[PDB]
Amino acid sequence: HPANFCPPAKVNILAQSRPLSEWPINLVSKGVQEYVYGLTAAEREANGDFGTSRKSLDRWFARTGVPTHGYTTVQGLNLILRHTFNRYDGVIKKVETRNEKRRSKATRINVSREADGAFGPDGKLKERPGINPSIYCYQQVSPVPYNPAKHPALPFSGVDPGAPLPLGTPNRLSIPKGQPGYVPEWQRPHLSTKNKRIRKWYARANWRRKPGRKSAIPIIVTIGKDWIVMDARGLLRAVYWRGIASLKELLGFFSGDPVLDPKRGIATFTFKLGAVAVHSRKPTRGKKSKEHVGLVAIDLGQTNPVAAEFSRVKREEPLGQIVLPDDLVKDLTRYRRAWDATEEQIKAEAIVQLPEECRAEVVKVNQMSAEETKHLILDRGVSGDLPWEKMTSNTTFISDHLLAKGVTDQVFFEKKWVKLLRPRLSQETRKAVNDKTWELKRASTEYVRLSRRKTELARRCVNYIVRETKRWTQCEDIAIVIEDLNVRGERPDGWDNFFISKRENRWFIQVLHKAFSDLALHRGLPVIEA
RNA sequence: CGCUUGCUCGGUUCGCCGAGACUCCC
């Protein structure tokens, strides 16, 4: 019930003394990565006893012989080794869950056919994790507002903690024609009355005008003789949008132990325990809480990605159905074409990656579907007198023709011919297809962007659903009831249809289900999964 | 009543405007 969640807040970095690679705090954290990511499985159990104690840290470096490059400090050296231990442990934990996926799928796969009819030899983990030089800051180096008097005096700005920060622009309509920032004469009567986030700079008009944004709210982080400054404007967006809204008061909301990503160029702050009043929860099968309560039955219909029978329920009544607006479906349809255009384009390159001998099998399982069906004719002994289009799910006419032959009489077994001679991709080639395809999906800029947009649209749909439920059902408690996707219609009579798959689905099926389940943790909205 | 940076998708003879997400990381 108490708020036990801490969302992230991202912060832009202005300037650095010297690159973070040369910092001693990170440099020691690289010697705790060559060793802790290369020792055998038996060795890890031997070296896991080093913790908050002062003498315990310095004793390890005597044994492991990892050079402590001047970074002799406690309360900041534990975070150097805890995350490497967790990352080392997390990799093994990841393989255990992966094996469960194979094991669980193995039971279903054999039953479906039945009804029809990573440490290696050395002990060190293979594919060992990379060096992440993110600097894990700590409370003793808690960021503070910049002051030109005591700091390096970098030329950006100054800070008045007692006085509030300045508004973006006052009286946007009042600015003359020459000074940027006023509403033009052709755009006057189309202004929003809502409380949207007012923006000033990035419209790509003079986006390169670096003196623009810099003319700023600086806060400083200094480890030893190495310092860095960033922008509190990032903190300001979060404090305003989230509704929790003095620079010290702004820094007081967030934590003094952020993460300094060198490559990303962004620092990641974490809220305090009570800064965001959201309780991370877990899906409940039933009887979550007797506790009116607004209940939404998210049905993932084929026609519309979301469909919701709003119902007002009470302890010891349908309110109608509202699905989605035209514009949002248009955006999803816009993304449908956006996501599709990349997939076959990326998937086409997968065949290019696959060797000439290994790409040959893919041609058979796809283009030759009928060719293997031509063999199916010979094995079943069926003739051409029975047209392919004549068949439907009621395919007993084959059995009648099969009984006419009688050589093979696989009809009396335990039941629920299509799958029995249906070929499948060879395992050795399969593992080449998926991995290579994965390699490009993690190396293509477009796909990573679309994955971000996929999730943003996922929350857009759940935001619309909860907002409508709060409005249409007039309730404060939103109890979401999604359908379990662990085990999930068209009837074209042609044989080709049986080969054709993907019933206009699986675009957002996995995405809304994980997104809706995330509302239990990220927002604390109950999710009664069933 | 109530939002300066970063990011997503929109309209514009270019001033600017309409909307969206924010639990992150490996």
d(CA A339, CA A450): 7
Residues A129 and A41 in one domain: yes
Amino acid at A170: P
Q: Is strand B within 7 Å of residue A394 (CB)?
A: no
The residue range of the domain holding A391 is: 357-433
Identify the domain boundary among A215, A235, A270.
A270
Domain count, chain A: 4
Q: Is residue A234 part of a domain?
A: yes
Residues A312 and A214 in one domain: no
Q: Is strand B within 7 Å of residue A170 (CB)?
A: no
Q: Is residue A340 part of a domain?
A: no
Nearest to A466 by CA among A240, A298, A238, A239: A298
Nucleotides of B under 7 A from a protein CB: 1-11, 14-26
d(CA A72, CA A24): 10
Q: Which residues of A102-118 are buried (b: 16+ CB within 10 A; e: fewer)?
A: eeeeeeeeeeeeeebee
3-state secondary structure (DSSP) of residue A268? strand
Is A478:A296 a contact under the CB 8 Å cutoff?
yes
Q: Is strand B within 7 Å of residue A359 (CB)?
A: no
Q: Is strand B within 7 Å of residue A191 (CB)?
A: yes
Nearest to A328 by CA among A505, A473, A203, A465: A465
Method: cryo-EM
Residues A209 and A84 in one domain: no
Q: Is residue A120 part of a domain?
A: yes
Closest amino acid to nucleotide B11 (CA–C1'): A187
Identify the domain boundary among A433, A459, A482.
A433
Q: How crowded is residue A320: how many other Cβ atoms within 10 Å of its Cβ? A: 10
Q: Is residue A126 part of a domain?
A: yes
Residues A330 and A459 in one domain: yes
Residues A297 and A415 in one domain: no
Q: Please, what is the Cα angle at A343 between A373 and A353, to 5 degrees?
A: 75
Which residues 331-350 of A interface with strand B at a CB distance below 7 A? Answer: 331, 334
Six-digit token pair at A80? 């150097």
Cβ-based burial of A303 (10 A; exposed 0-12, middle 13-18, buried ≥19): exposed
Q: Which residues of A242-262 are buried (b: 16+ CB within 10 A; e: fewer)?
A: eeeeebeebbebbbbbbbbbb
Q: Which residues of A484-520 are buried (b: 16+ CB within 10 A; e: fewer)?
A: eeeeeeeeeeebeebeeeeeeeebbeebbbebbbbbb
Cα A49 from chain centre: 34
Q: Is strand B within 7 Å of residue A199 (CB)?
A: yes
Q: Is strand B within 7 Å of residue A193 (CB)?
A: yes
Resolution in A: 3.3
Distance A442 CA to B26 C1' (A): 14
Q: Is residue A275 part of a domain?
A: no
Q: End-to-end alpha-carbon separation of chain A, Å?
A: 23
Q: List A271's β-bridge partners, or say none.
A: A254
Six-digit token pair at A221? 């982080």
Q: Is strand B within 7 Å of residue A130 (CB)?
A: yes
Which residues 230-249 of A interface with strand B at a CB distance below 7 A? Answer: 231, 233-234, 236-238, 240-243, 245
Q: What nucleotide is nearest A518 when CA is compared to C1'?
A: B23
